[PDB]
């Protein structure tokens, strides 16, 4: 479970060209999740 700053995941928008990054990264959603 990779952590990046205040996130418990690695945003895919900063992986650039690292293939190992794209295998574990997650995308910031288009909408703020509810409860």
């Amino acid at each position, epitope marked *: 479970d990779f952590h990046f700053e205040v996130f418990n995941f690695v*945003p895919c928008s900063i992986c650039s060209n690292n293939p190992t990054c794209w295998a574990i990264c997650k995308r910031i959603p288009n909408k703020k999740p509810g409860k």
Partner: antibody
Amino acid sequence: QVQLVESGGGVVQPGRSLRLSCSASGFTFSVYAMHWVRQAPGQGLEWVAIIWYDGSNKYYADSVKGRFTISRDNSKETLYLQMNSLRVEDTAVYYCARDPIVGHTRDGLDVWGQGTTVTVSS
Amino acid sequence: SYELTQPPSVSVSPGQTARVTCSGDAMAEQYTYWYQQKPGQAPVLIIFKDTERPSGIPERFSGSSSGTTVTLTISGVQTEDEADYYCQSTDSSGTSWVFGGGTKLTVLG
């Protein structure tokens, strides 16, 4: 250190325009949503606008809809607020704040700047 | 349109327990957040996602929820806790952010 510095405030007449800037440093600016929040003298906080990390989603308060435009430049880690058709009731201190949207250890408007003062008067 | 209801003022003595409530029609589906603002300073995050306290915030601050009403609780209040406290959430569509009217917490020190 994580830091947000607002600038561009000043005194303007009603109907004029003003452009605020918010320069970030110390964190990956390009993965956070960014807010504008204002506070009139002696009054409470009022949400103004938000922009998504990639600049897509932009939402505004009804009190500023059609007059204010929010934008960001991730290459310079700067947030902007274009304020047109300014009114007397727009007089406030204007803060910028980051928002992870899906934060884990911190969430919401977890980092605020010190604000910049905008005064609209004839 | 969508508004959060927050008491304008609460008074407390040091050592007592201060409580600040905040209600909203969509709070059962939308997370709520709490900010502290001292005179002349920027707001500071105290509680996020109803109940979570960030590291660096004293343990005496806590938050809870009963549905459409959330509560900020400060046990053993200190004189340094005197400030304005704002609740904040989103509307039912999750595309508009709203602040409560703010609660001035007076600590009789």
